[PDB]
Design an enzyme around this catalytic site. Structure first.
Site, PDB file in Angstrom:
ATOM      1  N   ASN A   7      13.390  -6.402  -3.468  1.00 16.18           N
ATOM      2  CA  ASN A   7      14.187  -5.353  -4.096  1.00 16.18           C
ATOM      3  C   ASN A   7      13.432  -4.647  -5.214  1.00 16.18           C
ATOM      4  O   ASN A   7      12.727  -5.285  -5.999  1.00 16.18           O
ATOM      5  CB  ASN A   7      15.474  -5.943  -4.674  1.00 16.18           C
ATOM      6  CG  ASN A   7      16.344  -6.596  -3.622  1.00 16.18           C
ATOM      7  OD1 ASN A   7      16.751  -5.962  -2.651  1.00 16.18           O
ATOM      8  ND2 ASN A   7      16.638  -7.877  -3.813  1.00 16.18           N
ATOM      9  N   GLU A 174       0.482   1.987   0.021  1.00 13.94           N
ATOM     10  CA  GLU A 174      -0.890   2.169  -0.447  1.00 13.94           C
ATOM     11  C   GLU A 174      -1.142   1.393  -1.734  1.00 13.94           C
ATOM     12  O   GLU A 174      -2.241   0.882  -1.949  1.00 13.94           O
ATOM     13  CB  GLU A 174      -1.237   3.649  -0.619  1.00 13.94           C
ATOM     14  CG  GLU A 174      -1.054   4.497   0.645  1.00 13.94           C
ATOM     15  CD  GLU A 174      -2.058   4.209   1.770  1.00 13.94           C
ATOM     16  OE1 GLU A 174      -2.868   3.255   1.668  1.00 13.94           O
ATOM     17  OE2 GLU A 174      -2.026   4.958   2.775  1.00 13.94           O
ATOM     18  N   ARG A 177      -1.853  -2.055  -0.712  1.00 15.36           N
ATOM     19  CA  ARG A 177      -3.201  -2.109  -0.151  1.00 15.36           C
ATOM     20  C   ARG A 177      -4.329  -2.029  -1.184  1.00 15.36           C
ATOM     21  O   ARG A 177      -5.379  -2.637  -0.990  1.00 15.36           O
ATOM     22  CB  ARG A 177      -3.410  -0.976   0.851  1.00 15.36           C
ATOM     23  CG  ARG A 177      -2.656  -1.127   2.171  1.00 15.36           C
ATOM     24  CD  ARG A 177      -2.831   0.172   2.950  1.00 15.36           C
ATOM     25  NE  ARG A 177      -2.269   0.128   4.294  1.00 15.36           N
ATOM     26  CZ  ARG A 177      -2.285   1.167   5.125  1.00 15.36           C
ATOM     27  NH1 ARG A 177      -2.828   2.317   4.732  1.00 15.36           N
ATOM     28  NH2 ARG A 177      -1.770   1.058   6.347  1.00 15.36           N
TER      29      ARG A 177
END
Ligand SMILES: [Cl-]
Ligand SMILES: [Cl-]
Ligand SMILES: [Cl-]
Ligand SMILES: [Cl-]
Ligand SMILES: [Cl-]
EC number: 3.2.2.22
Lengths: 264, 124
Positions: A7, A174, A177
């Site tokens: 969450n 992203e 990542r």
């Protein structure tokens, strides 16, 4: 067995709450047991049980609107979302991924697969705006959540839906990542600012797959061939080795098994 | 500058003054808020989002009180027993670094007001 749920709320978001959110996402994406040249790898899709294939990211804002994104653990990318009693999926690239997404949001009474894919080239076209034209930050995320929600009621048009996907994917997928991209988001939160991503962010995003391959196929960290990246000001430079990317990349897509290690 | 300060000015030594800091658009109620002053800039006081925890710098301890009204999205600095050495530009800020207040008001306090002059003098 439910997919794991993480969450996050834009309401009162802090650097700390965002930090905890991104760390939790990473923790659910991979165990971190598979590491190449000091960078963690996502799960191999081969033999990966369907009940371990996805994670869910529940987003809400001050208006109490909520949407839930589904992320594929094999690439950390958003495959679809749910808002209220409707769910929407990007076009699957193959039959097996089409089968996989049937396991997501299975109670929804309104189920849709977009004809179009969720890659940036497509989303930018639909949005009528490039990533470099689209502001990121807590405010943009709050607005993207609302826009995703209202799509289900006809209150959002496709271009705005696409723009909202572009915002969510970067600030979640992203950021997960790339430590570097997470950091750029931290700065925006710290000063309550919104701004489009600089070329360094955009080119890292574009290069993630290629960087994953280069690192995993490297000879002791040395790249077979150089990869070109961009600085914050847009200027180009070449990377020849995994070293400089260690503080930059947080996760890699699984490309191959590592070279067999000797027992000696 | 996303915060709006008010209430400064001239005050007799030993007198009192109250500063206000309001948030037109910013959701101040969710964040630690603090007051700072500059005659180098230094922290004066901070208060948790919920208002249940406060910290004060040593030189104002017992004389200054920080408070907040979340329903009005406002934060206050009550200054009592004012001294000439309290003369400075005072500014409010909200911290978005930490989810809770930190001891000694540690944080980035990246959202701030313009600041107000507080002058403690018998003159006038
Ligand atoms: Cl979280
Ligand atoms: Cl693309
Ligand atoms: Cl772009
Ligand atoms: Cl160049
Ligand atoms: Cl007094």
């Amino acid at each position: 067995k439910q997919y794991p749920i993480i969450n996050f709320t834009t309401a009162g978001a802090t650097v700390q709450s965002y930090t905890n959110f991104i760390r939790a996402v990473r923790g659910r994406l991979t165990t971190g047991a598979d590491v190449r040249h000091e960078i963690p790898v996502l799960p191999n899709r081969v033999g990966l049980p369907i009940n371990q294939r996805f994670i869910l990211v529940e987003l809400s804002n001050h208006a109490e609107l909520s949407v839930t994104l589904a992320l594929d653990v094999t690439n950390a990318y958003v495959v679809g979302y749910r808002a209220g009693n409707s769910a929407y999926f990007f076009h699957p690239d193959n039959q097996e991924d089409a089968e996989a997404i049937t396991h997501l949001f299975t109670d929804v009474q309104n189920r849709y697969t977009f004809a179009f894919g969720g890659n940036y080239d497509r989303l930018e076209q639909l949005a009528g705006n490039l990533r470099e034209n689209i502001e990121l930050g807590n405010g943009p995320l709050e607005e993207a959540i609302s826009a995703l929600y209202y799509y289900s009621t006809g209150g959002t048009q496709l271009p705005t839906l696409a723009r909202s996907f572009i915002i969510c994917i970067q600030m979640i997928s992203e950021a997960a990542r790339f430590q570097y991209i997470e950091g750029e988001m931290r700065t925006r939160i710290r000063y309550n600012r919104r701004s489009a991503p600089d070329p360094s962010v955009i080119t890292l995003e574009n290069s993630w797959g290629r960087l994953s391959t280069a690192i995993q196929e490297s000879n002791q960290g040395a790249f077979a061939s150089p990869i070109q990246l961009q600085r914050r000001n847009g200027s180009k430079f070449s990377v020849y080795d995994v070293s400089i990317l260690i503080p930059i990349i947080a996760l890699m897509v699984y490309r191959c098994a590592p070279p067999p290690s000797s027992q000696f | 500058v996303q915060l709006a300060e008010t209430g400064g000015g001239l005050v007799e030594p030993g007198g009192s003054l109250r500063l206000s800091c309001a948030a037109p658009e910013f959701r101040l109620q969710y964040y630690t808020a603090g007051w700072f002053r500059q005659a180098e800039r230094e922290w004066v006081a901070c208060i948790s989002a919920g208002g249940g925890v406060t910290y004060y710098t040593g030189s104002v301890q017992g004389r200054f009180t920080i408070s907040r009204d979340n329903a009005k999205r406002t934060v206050y600095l009550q200054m009592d027993s004012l001294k000439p050495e309290d003369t400075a530009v005072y500014s409010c800020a909200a911290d978005l670094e930490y989810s809770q207040i930190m001891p000694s008001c540690r944080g980035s306090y990246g959202v701030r007001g313009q600041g107000t002059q507080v002058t403690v003098s018998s003159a006038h």
